[PDB]
Design a protein around this nucleic acid. Structure first.
Lengths: 50, 50, 120, 250
DNA sequence: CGCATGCTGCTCTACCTCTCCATGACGGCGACTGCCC
RNA sequence: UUCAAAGCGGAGAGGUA
DNA sequence: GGGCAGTCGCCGTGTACCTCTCCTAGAGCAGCATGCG
């Protein structure tokens, strides 16, 4: 409803594409392992959508 | 919009014998499925019954 | 070419079972190109028992461990780790940044010396 | 404190997570008590094993504890003299660290102890009546929690000795050594450093420190208050016609 | 008329790893950690 | 001359003052 | 380097008495009842 409030976050943290979004999600959830797109996809699917 | 009160009886629930027995049955069934999956593959020829 | 030997840490009491299941897995997955061979080493020593029977006890040199010959690949690593009743690969260990437990392990291939030593 | 190292580095050298340099002799980028890594050790090995030139006096690195060697190398007297000479001049605001080091060094000098005694080579066993076996009503045994921990320690020790006899590959001997460290640590104190060891149920086992430390430990339950003989208990009613200094006993 | 197979009781030993078992307490005190000069 | 066969640890739940 | 806010982990949280219940998994080995031609 108020998009400029979130636009502040967008500007401060930088826009993400799908690939790098999953890369960063995998990096933060499971550190110490090499990032993978399929890894992040499987992690999300097992976490919330199973 | 309004913040929530956690002691309100509209935010609290009652669980009785049915739900707790359901949870115990679920745990036992998960263990049983693990045993079944482990045992089913040990035989090459079928020679098997449910 | 890159046929390296690795040692896999196994749960207590599961040595022949894991080897049999792993051989079935590789033969049904038709992935012999990556996973080559699985083995456990034994030696049939002879011992006197309590009832006087001269019993041939087949003792494992390395209890709790299995030996494989394979080529390191992410798919191969993922499909050997997913085998039931296996803990991890023995190798270099890393500290866990968040939590308390065993972290990422980097497998270490066996040098030709000891694999030639054992296999004879 | 004694080794002038942060706790994280010492904890990494123990538990077989990193290496440590014991002699950096004849090199440029290696310093005493510097933490190496597996790839760093491999790349240094690629140069030391070539034996081309400028690398005589092979440096020693050791991925085990090697805390015994680092603590044996201590030379308390001259370390104390150097620390005093440094503490005499300049204070800033963070000379308290050198004060703590000097205090510990002076304690070890005065007591005439050796720091390397903090690394164990033998352990004692408690007499068997303080960890007894009791029999339940149905004939089942209720053994203590100390017997399980002692059994684990002995089994791992015997297995490691057997492996060392056969000259097994080193990468498995290191795993056995790490497991033995964790077992002895769990016997001494359970759940202090790593993960708690659970027994039959998912409840923790009782270690040697749990006997003495709690509110239900030995100090507060058996030494500062006990059960006694020639004693009784009952309900009280009112007695008139009694004189003060008199009571009525059934 | 007799032959082949599942169920039950006793015995004997051995232990490591996770998806982590929880994410509604509150104060005090000491030891890292990223950030700004 | 001998004694001698009845005592056992932990965990959870509730109560009285 | 000096100086931090900020954060993570360990320590501590009444006394005496009474009643009830329950207490290690897995695998290996040997002897008795049951349906069929």
């Amino acid at each position: 409803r108020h998009p400029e409030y979130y636009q502040k976050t967008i500007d401060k943290e930088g826009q993400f594409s799908e690939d790098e979004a999953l890369m960063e999600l995998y990096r933060k959830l499971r550190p110490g392992e090499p990032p993978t797109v399929s890894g992040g996809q499987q992690l999300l699917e097992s976490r919330f959508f199973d | 919009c309004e913040v929530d009160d956690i002691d309100h009886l509209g935010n609290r629930r009652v669980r009785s014998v049915g739900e707790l027995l359901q949870n115990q049955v679920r745990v036992g069934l998960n263990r049983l499925e693990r045993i079944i999956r482990e045992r089913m593959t040990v035989s090459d020829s079928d020679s098997l019954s449910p | 070419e890159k046929a390296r030997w690795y040692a896999v840490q196994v749960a207590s009491g599961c040595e022949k079972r894991v080897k049999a299941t792993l051989e079935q897995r590789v033969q049904t997955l038709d992935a012999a190109n990556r996973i080559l061979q699985v083995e456990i080493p034994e030696t049939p020593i002879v011992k006197l028992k309590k009832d006087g029977s001269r019993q041939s006890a087949e003792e494992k040199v390395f209890p709790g461990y299995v030996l494989v010959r394979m080529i390191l690949d992410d798919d191969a690593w993922q499909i050997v780790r997913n085998t039931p009743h296996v803990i991890n690969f023995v190798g270099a260990e890393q500290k866990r940044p968040y939590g308390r437990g065993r972290g990422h392990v980097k497998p270490m291939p066996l040098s030709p010396g000891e694999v030639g030593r054992i296999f004879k | 404190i004694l080794l002038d190292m942060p706790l994280r580095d010492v904890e990494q050298i123990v538990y077989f997570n990193s290496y440590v340099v014991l002699n950096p002799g004849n090199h440029s980028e290696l310093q005493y008590k510097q933490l190496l890594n597996e790839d760093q050790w491999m790349e240094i090995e690629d140069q030391i094993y070539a034996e081309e030139s400028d690398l005589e006096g092979i440096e020693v690195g050791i991925g085990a504890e090697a805390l015994q060697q680092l603590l044996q190398d201590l030379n308390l007297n001259e370390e104390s003299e150097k620390l005093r000479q440094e503490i005499a001049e300049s204070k800033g605001q963070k000379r308290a660290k050198l004060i703590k080091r000097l205090r510990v060094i002076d304690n070890f000098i005065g007591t005439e102890s050796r720091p390397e005694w903090m690394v164990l080579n033998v352990i004692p066993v408690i007499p068997p009546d303080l960890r007894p076996m009791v029999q339940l009503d149905g004939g089942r045994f209720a053994t203590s929690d100390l017997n399980d921990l002692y059994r684990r320690v002995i089994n791992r020790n015997n297995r490691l000795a057997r492996l060392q006899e056969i000259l097994a590959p080193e990468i498995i001997v290191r795993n056995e050594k790490r497991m033995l460290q964790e077992a002895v640590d769990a016997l001494i104190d359970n759940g202090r450093r790593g993960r708690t060891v659970v027994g039959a149920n998912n409840r923790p086992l009782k270690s040697l420190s749990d006997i003495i430390e709690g509110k239900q430990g030995r100090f507060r339950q058996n030494l500062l208050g006990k059960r006694v003989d020639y004693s009784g208990r009952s309900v009280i009613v009112v007695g008139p016609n009694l004189k003060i200094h008199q009571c009525g006993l059934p």
